[PDB]
Design a protein around this nucleic acid. Structure first.
Ligand SMILES: [Zn+2]
Ligand SMILES: [Zn+2]
Ligand SMILES: [Zn+2]
Lengths: 6, 175
DNA sequence: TTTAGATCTAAA
DNA sequence: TTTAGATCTAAA
């Protein structure tokens, strides 16, 4: 999936 | 603080309009060495995996994830590079994440700060922007904290985040 | 274990 | 100086 970790 | 330009919003902006706005911005900021003679056809003078560096897709993939400051919270090799023209199926671009971060710093970081293209959407479940792991719904395109989805049978976050990882469909979309 | 970022090498 | 690929480390 498209992801991000902020 | 912001470029005036009046460039199209990033969801509908063409590659040529974007790149011309980047060139104009780099010149007004005094980085003349980054804009070679010969206009848009020659910009940028940087090569990645034997093709000219694709700044448009590099920019779109980073700002859609919250901008450069997200850092290694972006999967550069697996989710940014894979969307660029520079990607090939079989490549040995083992240092590509570091390379892409350096190119973003050179060409795009000041530009990012001077525009309003960075995604700041809240979680579709809890409606906040709390720090943490997020997944983008493949169906509706909204964003969710992984931690806010308590359905059984979800994979580990790392299996969504790895290149060509698991499909994610949010609880609101799921049939 | 797997995956990806950082660093170094060697070739231009 | 810039780039591609090997080989480190970090993280999960
Ligand atoms: Zn602009
Ligand atoms: Zn949430
Ligand atoms: Zn959805």
């Amino acid at each position: 999936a498209r992801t991000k970790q902020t | 603080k912001k470029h005036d330009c009046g460039r199209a919003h990033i969801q509908v902006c063409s590659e040529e309009e974007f790149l011309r706005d980047v060139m104009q911005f780099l010149l007004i900021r005094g980085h003349t060495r980054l804009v070679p003679p010969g206009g848009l056809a020659e910009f940028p003078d940087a090569v990645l995996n034997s093709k000219r560096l694709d700044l448009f897709n590099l920019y779109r993939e980073v700002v859609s994830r919250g901008g450069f400051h997200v850092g290694n919270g972006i999967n550069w090799k697996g989710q940014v590079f894979s969307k660029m023209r520079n990607h090939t199926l079989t490549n040995r671009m083992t240092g590509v994440g570091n390379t892409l971060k350096r190119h973003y710093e050179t060409y795009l970081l000041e530009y990012e700060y001077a525009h309003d293209d960075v995604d700041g959407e809240c979680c579709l479940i809890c409606r906040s922007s709390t720090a943490g792991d997020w997944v983008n719904c493949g169906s509706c395109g909204e964003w969710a904290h992984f931690g806010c989805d308590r359905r059984p049978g979800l994979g580990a976050f790392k299996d969504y985040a790895k290149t060509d990882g698991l499909e994610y469909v949010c609880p609101n979309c799921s049939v």
